[PDB]
């Protein structure tokens, strides 16, 4: 599914 | 290539490049900064990760578009162009892995830095695994696994269960299990146990730490909803 | 650089690059196609324009971000990096202008192709004018004006007032008047007269031609609302 | 204000 984004947004 | 620019100027320009949404430039500035040979601060590690995650993220999205067209098609042009994008993607992953191996990981002694870099190592081997098909594909998968596992072992010994790096690592390793390793049950188990152990530690956190931990917990939950 | 690839393969790959949102690749494939020396079809002209408009559009947005930071600031890094982006942008504009001059415009005899290319010429001089400050800035502005004017003269003689290329040309020339030439009244007049003359010709059009003409008329109207 | 986009979208 989704991995961590590079920034909190 | 950036050898003549001051470290501080490279960092400053990486921040400007992010604001301008110039992520290839960002990545080049951060590669230059790493190559100065000094360790990176927390903020600088995030600049490095943001830059390359965005560059490779765009390559991955393009590779997926082209791979879909190629699979529907099955002249040489679609395969040739998918191969071109694939080679570029592999080159960027190799560059990041090379920075981690020379010499970010070996100089990282604090748990936070070492886990951060090993999580990155797992991620870039995972991106290589997404496009791999040849004699080395099992070995690429195992390289990702090994990096994530070492990061997990350190994180569980040295960081609280709400630490955002520990949480993001578990998130990404769970994606590895589901999407790469064909281990959906391991993926679900890891995401669930991570979520529950973080939930039980939220009471210790300030408002700002709570916001970060719950943000990543929601990503774990979003995956669990998709997978179950 | 693309000299060894077939023209048809370059066109095919430009279409794939657009689908993959790889606009730099798209532009390189289309430059290679133009350099084969043959005229371009309607569809191929649109691929060329889409590719470079997207590349330079991203450079313009980044230059604007950096120029804003620089103006608020007023070390050398912000100016240096804005200059780097500016030089890159100028290089792309020079490349497009060079394709138009060698030899797309001179071989374009039909009104539709010649207007298309002269509209592009006006646009890329306009993009150069947006970043110009030196001894040649007046001359860059006049080069844009001259290209747009020749395109206007041909379009008014050879195309109906609803033709989408004629409409897009008038739209962009009106933006030139407002944003570059400091002639907001000329911009408003051109947009109004273009809109009204197109409105009066819509009755002649099929459903699909009507949709294209009204789409651009709405852009003219959106500018008029912003400017009045 | 706005110039023409590269595609109808
Ligand atoms: C892999 C990783 C995990 C957390 C962080 S962070 O806590 O420093 N932070 C900044 C980077 O982007 C984030 C996204 C989210 Cl959803 C939560 C926290 C962060 C950095 C790297
Ligand atoms: C400059 C120009 C004007 C119209 C066209 S087009 O009619 O071929 N077409 C395709 C390209 O993008 C468009 C956008 C809009 Cl809003 C309307 C029509 C088009 C091409 C170039
Ligand atoms: Cl190719
Ligand atoms: Cl150290
Ligand atoms: Cl620079
Ligand atoms: Cl001709
Ligand atoms: Mg120094
Ligand atoms: Mg040939």
Does A2 contact B175 at a Cβ distance shorter than 8 Å? yes
Question: What secondary structure does DSSP assign to B125-141, as a single string?
Answer: HHHHHHH--STTHHHHH
Crossing angle between the packed helical segments C42-73 and C23-34, to the nearest 10 degrees? 130
List Cβ neighbours of B197 (8 Å cut-off, separation of 6 or more).
B161
Query: Is residue B150 in contact with ligand 1, taking CB distance under 6 Å?
Result: no
Does chain B reach chain A with at least 3 CB pairs under 8 Å?
yes
Q: Which residues of B touch C (CB under 8 A)?
A: 9, 12-13, 16-17, 19-22, 58, 61-62, 65-66, 69, 75, 77-78, 80-81, 85
Number of H helices and number of E strands within chain C? 10, 0
Question: How far, in Å, is the centroid of ligand 1 from the Cα of C66?
Answer: 26
Domain layout of chain B by residue ranges: 7-227
- Whether the link from the prior residue into B108 is cis, omega within 30° of 0, is no
3-state secondary structure of B149: helix
List the Cα angle C109/C111/C114 in 5-degree steps: 65
Q: Are the C-beta atoms of C180 and C129 separated by less than 8 Å?
A: yes
Query: Is residue A7 in contact with ligand 1, taking CB distance under 6 Å?
Result: yes
Give the C-alpha distances (Å, rounded to integers) separating C58 from B159, C29, C64, C65. Answer: 41, 18, 10, 11
Does A4 contact B216 at a Cβ distance shorter than 8 Å? yes
| Annotation: CATH topology of B7-227 | Delta-Endotoxin; domain 1 (1.20.190)
Crossing angle between the packed helical segments B164-179 and B184-199, to the nearest 10 degrees? 160
- Residues in chain B with CB shorter than 8 Å from the CB of C69 are 16, 19
B223/chain A closest Cα distance in angstroms: 6
Ligand 1 atom closest to the Cα of residue B215 is 16
For residue A4, the chain B residue with the least C-alpha distance is B168
Length, in residues, of chain B: 228
Tokens encoding B184:
């959906």
Neighbours of C208 (CB within 10 A): 8
């Amino acid at each position: 599914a989704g991995s961590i984004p590079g920034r909190r947004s | 290539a950036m050898g003549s620019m001051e470290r501080a100027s490279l960092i400053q320009k990486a921040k400007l490049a992010e604001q301008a949404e110039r992520y290839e430039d960002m990545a080049a500035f951060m590669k230059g900064a790493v190559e100065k040979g000094e360790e990176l601060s927390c903020e600088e590690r995030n600049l490095l990760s943001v830059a390359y995650k965005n560059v490779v993220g765009g390559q991955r999205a393009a590779w997926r578009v082209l791979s879909s067209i190629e699979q529907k098609s099955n002249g040489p042009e679609v395969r040739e162009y998918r191969e071109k994008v694939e080679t570029e993607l592999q080159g960027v992953c190799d560059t990041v892995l090379g920075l981690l191996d020379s010499h970010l990981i070996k100089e990282a002694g604090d748990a936070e830095s070492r886990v951060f870099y090993l999580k990155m190592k797992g991620d870039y081997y995972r991106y290589l695994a997404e496009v791999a098909t040849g004699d080395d594909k099992k070995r690429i998968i195992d390289s990702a696994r090994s990096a994530y596992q070492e990061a997990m072992d350190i994180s569980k010994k040295e960081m609280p269960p709400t630490n955002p790096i520990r949480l993001g690592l578990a998130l990404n390793f769970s994606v590895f299990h589901y999407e790469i390793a064909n281990s959906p049950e391991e993926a679900i188990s890891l995401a669930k146990t991570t979520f529950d152990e973080a939930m039980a530690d939220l009471h210790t956190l300030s408002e700002d730490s709570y916001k970060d931990s719950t943000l990543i917990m929601q990503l774990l939950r979003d995956n669990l909803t998709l997978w179950t």
